[model samples]
Structure formats: structure tokens, C-alpha cells
Target chain A: SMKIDVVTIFPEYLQPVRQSLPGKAIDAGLVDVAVHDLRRWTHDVHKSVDDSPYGGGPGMVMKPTVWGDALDEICTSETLLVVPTPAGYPFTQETAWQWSTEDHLVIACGRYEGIDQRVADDAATRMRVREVSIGDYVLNGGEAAALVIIEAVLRLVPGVLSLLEGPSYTRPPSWRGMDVPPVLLSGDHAKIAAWRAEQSRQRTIERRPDLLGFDS
Target chain B: SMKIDVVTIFPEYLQPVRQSLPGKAIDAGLVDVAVHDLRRWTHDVHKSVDDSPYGGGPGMVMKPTVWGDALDEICTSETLLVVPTPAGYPFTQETAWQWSTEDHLVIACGRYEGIDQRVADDAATRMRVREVSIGDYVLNGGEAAALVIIEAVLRLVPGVLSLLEGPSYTRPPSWRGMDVPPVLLSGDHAKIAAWRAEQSRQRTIERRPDLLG
Candidate 1:
């Protein structure tokens, strides 16, 4: 089982994890998840977590001290610190598959500009620190990206279904003049399996050729 | 102002939008946002939205009829249907910038295997339909992706701050022996601007070279 902890200013943003499949996995004893509020570790009366950029920019950068204190207390020696940022390495299915084998993950969700770079640099001294990005687009914060990352990684754990299935259909078989390719209903197990394989292959060729060893 | 409607099985999954920047954009009248539950359109007692795949599969596929009905009511002639799927086109910042110009967007959040293929095909005739994937990785559902997409797109709207700023530091000047880059405290606007530009360029080169033209 994997243990995951998410540190964010907006704790409510992580609430959906409790209602999704990850939550079910937690309840089933397949994983343990926790959400930590960054403000809880703030020293000031206002609980400010960010400040002006060092090089003079438009947005505020998360303070290194606040993040430093929080991560120091929550992260274990074996924890893998996953920092979600637009500038990090692209996160893919392969990354998810690799991460599922880890014992613990601490995802630091950065808002505004991003967390101070020193935070990750400092953490790398003891624990494993991986800077991961979900996609090419920029986000308001890392909370949403963190959610996507958590879902992708946790679903790959041992007990979860991890196979890449093809398009599916049910009941009507025919809807709005679109028929569910007749082979699926032919009941020929061998032929049905072949047809599904072809469908999956065709789809990969058309949409994501990169998965089949071709440049996308 | 732009308008958005998100259809999902887990409505609570979208609640964060109301608490994030997108919610503030709505409150500020920069955008109109609404969340619709896919099960609300179901006719059966269980309000089922998915079923076994036509060909044998491990997971269920979102039913066509339910999605068809839900989208039929939510979409407009001018609406751009955004379907989040792993098989769809990559959703990049360019996509977000282009989508921000649209008057309305209907985001279909598919769970389980995915929404029936027919849903996108059928919707294409009446409105603009684009199947977009946030990244290469797959999630339990599209709700998280929708949140990411919404945040990316909505922030580009007129009233919001959309500039791509570089790294930042604040107060204290120094912490734990790590000092803020000395150039920023120089107090010369020209030098500061040049320093920031070089920092941004160096960062883009080091972290994301694809961003620089």
C-alpha cells in the first residue's frame, strides 16, 4: 500500500480525492492519504504563504520558510517529494507506473508563481525529489495538477485495475443510428477478442501513435 | 464574459472551482460557470450513467443515451464541446488561449472507460466539438482535468491577470542561509528588468525549452 500526503494552501481543493476512486482505495486499506494545510505552519498573524518575486515579476512566490517548516515536519526519510510545476518533467503513464511502487509520496502544491526553488533543492539532500508537470498548459495553482497526479499514481497500485481498455458500449447496442460494431455481439470469443485488439490498435494509430513507438 | 458548463458524475469533484481563481472570475462577472450532474438526465431508478462494453472489457463505458440527452440540453449552437479523453488532441496553452475567445464551452467529463464515441460524433454536426487530453497520463475521470482546463482557460479572460511571470521571493531577504538573488535588491529598474528577462529565459531553456520561440 502507498501512503500519500498533499501540502496545499487550499485544503478544500483536495476534498474530491475523498469522494473518488482514490478514496475508495483508502477505505479498502489499499492506500493511506492525508492533506496538510500550508497555513497551519505560517508564523505571521496573517498566515501569508507568498511574497514578491526576487527578480521583480508580476506574481507572488510561495515563501521558502513556510514551505520549509511544513515539509520538514511532514516528510519522512523514505518519502518521494513530488513537486507539481509547469516547468517540471512531463508526467506520463510510465511515470505513474513507476511511482505506484513507491512506499510514500509527498506532493507539494504550489500556487501563484510557484514554491521557492530552494525548497526542492533543500529537500533533495535527504529524500527523493521529483519535479513533475502534468501537461504543457499553465494552471492557477498546482492543486488541480496534484489531484490529477494523485489519481493517476494511486490507480496503478497493485489491487487497482490498470489495464488500458478500448472503447465500450452497452444495452442499446445501437444509438442514434450508430451501431455497436456487430462483432461484439456475435458471441465468437476468439473473433471478438481479435476485433477488440484491432479496435484498440486502430485507435492508438489514429490518436496516439507515440504509444506504438511512432512520433506523435 | 465567457460561459462554461461542466457535466460530470461527481459534481463534488468540481466544487474546488468555486473556491479557486475560476470562482473568483465568476464572482467578478468575468465568466459564468455552472456544474451539471450527468445522473440528473438518467431515466432509470438507479440513474445509471455507464454500462458493460460491447466487446468484453474490464471497465464500463459511459452510455451514449445518457450523455446524448445531457449534452443535447446543455449545448448551444455557438457552444464548443470540449471532451476530455486520452485519445483526443493534446490540450496546450495555445488551446487554452484559443478557447478563451469562445463565448461558450460545454465540457463533457467522461468517467469509467469513457463517453460513448457516438456522443462526440453526433454533437459535431450541430456544434464545434473538440476531444482534448490534458496530458499523456490517464485519471479515474475527467473532472480533475476539467478543473485544470477551466483554470487555464478562464485565467486568460480579459479581467484576469494572464502574464507568464518568472520565479519569485519575498521579505526576510535571507532564510536558512539562502539569500534572495542580489540583482533584485539593486533597486535599478533597468537592471532589474534585464536580470528578470535573463532569469526567465534561462529558466525556460533549462526547464521548458519548448516555450521560447
Candidate 2:
């Protein structure tokens, strides 16, 4: 089993995780996910978790105080601190695969312009802190990107996807006047396997040539 | 203003769009967002929106009929179609900036192993179609990926984030023992501007060296 915790200003932004495969993973006990409100760690009456950039910029930077308090309570020596930010290393399938084996995972969601850079620097003192970016773009916040990471990692959890096993199909093969490739209907196990592998490779080549070391 | 719509089987997965900046944009009428359930386009009694791939596959591929119907009804000559998938082109800040100027944008979320590749090929005929992948990793569905793209794009909407227009900070500048850099406190406007731009550049360099080119 995997233990994952997400701390974000808008716990509601991560609410979607509870409705999909991630939700199922939790229900089946394949993964335990807890969504925490980062604001809960704030010390002020206004419960502010962010402040303006020290040098000045367009967006507010999340204050180190709230984040510091949050991490102190949630992060353990065993936790892998994953920070989702455009400034972080590119997040990939290999990243998901590596984290899936961890006993405890903490995802810190950065909002506004970004988190105080020192907060990430400070977290590094206690555990493995990886600042990861989902892609090249900037999000309104990291909550959505955190959802993306959790969903991908959770599905890779052992026994979490047994119900989804096997090649799936519907009763009628024809759709929108297109016939299913005849091999699929032929039901020759070896032939079907070969065809699927070929199709998968072909699709990857055509669409994501970069994935195969052929820069697109 | 940008007109954006999302089509997905797991409409609930995208519900968070209503609570964050994207939701704020919608409420203020800066951007108009509509979430359409993909099942609504299914003609079958079971309301199935996906079928097995023409080639056998481990997961379901979204059916063409439902997607075709949905695209036909929602897309116009003026619409730009955005599809979220792992195998698609990398979604980036430049892509978001480009689409921010479009009059209408439609995002179709693919679930299961994938959507029929033909559906993306087919959609290209009616509108400017862009198949985008948030990163190299795969999500169980595109709804979450859609949220990531939408939130990024929504912020670039003019006036949507004007209040967040400048470097924002609250009281008690020194935090967790680190003092607010002294330059922001200095009253020199030119030095402050120059320092901010350099800091932004340095942070990007430190975090996303691949993006600077």
C-alpha cells in the first residue's frame, strides 16, 4: 500500500481525485490519500498562506511560515516531498513509477506566482524533496497538477487496477461506420497480441516520436 | 474573452474548475466555461462513450460516435479544438499564450487507455485541432489534465488576474528567519523593476532551463 498526502490552499481543487480511479484506490485500500488545507497551518487571524515576492512580481508567493508548519506536522523521514511547480524538473512516467514504491509521499501544491523558494530548500533538510513540474505551462495553482500526479501514480499501484485488466471491447464492433480491425474479431490470441503491440508502437511513433528518442 | 468547453465522461473530475481561478473567471464573465458530459452524446441504451480499440488493447478507447456527435454539435468553423492525451504534443506556456487569443476553444477529454486516434484525425477536418499532453506521464483520464490546461490558459485572460497584477505580499516581510530581500524595501523604482526581472529570469533558469531557449 502507498500513503500519499496533498496539502493545498484549495482542498476543493483536489476534490476531483476522490471521484475517479484515485477514489477507487482509496476505497479498496490500495492507497491511502489525505487532502489537507495548507491554511490550517497559518498562525495569523486572517490565515494568510502567501505574501508578495521579495523582489516584486505579478503573483503572490506562498509564505514559508504556513508551509513550514504544515510540513513539520505531515512530513516524516520516510516521506518523499513532491513539489509541483513549473520551476521543477519535468514530471514523467518514470517519476510516477519511482514514487509508487515509496511508503510515504507528500505533495505540496504551490499557488500564485510560486512558493517561497526557501520553503523547498528547507524541506530538503529533512527528506527527499523533488520539485516537479507537470509540463511547460503555468497553472493557476498546483492543485490540479497534484491531482494529475496522484491519479497517475495511484493507477500504477499493485492490485489497484485488477478490475480493469484485460483487453476491453463492446458488443458491437462497428462504430461510426468504421469496422474494428478484423484481427481483433478473429480472436487469435497470439495474433491479437502481436497486432496490439504493433498498433501501440505505431501510434506512439506517429504521435509522440519524442518518446522513442526521435525528436519531433 | 475566450469561450471554452470541456467534454468528459467523468464530469465530476473537472468540478474543481468551479472553485478556483477558472471558476472566478467564469463568475466574473471574463471567460465563459461550459462542462459537457460526454455520455450525453451516446445514442446507446447503456450510454457508453467508449469502445475497445480496433486493435485489441488493455483499456477502452472512447467511441467515435459519441465524440463525433459532440464535436459536430459544439465545434464551429471558428472553434479551436483541444484534445488532452499522453501521446499528443507537449502542452506548454507558448501554447497557452497562443490559444488565449482564440475566440472559441473546445477541449475534449479522453479516458481509459485512450480515445480512438481516428477521432482526433476526424476532428481536424472541422476545426483547428490541437492534441496536447500535459507531460510525458499518463493519467487515468484526461479530465485532470484538462483542468491543468484550462487553469493555465484562464489566467492569461485579460483582466481576470488584474488584481493579482503585481508582486503581492502581506505584512511581516521576513519569513521563517529569511528577510525580505532588501531591494523591495528600497524606494528606488528602477532598481526594484530590474531586480524583479532578473530574479524571475534566474528562477526560471534554475527551475526550467529547457524553457529559456
RMSD of each: 3.3, 4.9
The weakest ten consecutive residues by lDDT in model 2 chain A span A162-171
Model 2 regions lying over 4 Å from their true place: A16-18, A162-209, A212-216, B16-18, B162-213
Which docking class does model 2 fall in? acceptable
TM-score, each model? 0.88, 0.83
- Evaluated against the true chain A, what TM-score does chain A of model 1 have? 0.87
Over A1-216, each residue of candidate 1 has an lDDT whose tens digit, in order, gives 788999998777676445677877888789888889999999889999988876576778888888999999999889999998877766889999999999999999997477887788889988999987888787888988888898898788989652234566777888888888788899888999987788778877777776677664
Worst window of 10 by summed lDDT in candidate 2 chain B: B162-171
lDDT of 1 by residue, B38-145 (tens): 899998999999888776667888888999999989998899999988767679889999999999999999873788788888899899999878887878888878
Question: Taking the candidates in order, what DockQ does each have?
Answer: 0.55, 0.39
Note the Cα lDDT for every prediction shown.
0.82, 0.76
Assess the local accuracy of residue B82 in candidate 1 as a C-alpha lDDT between 0 and 100.
95
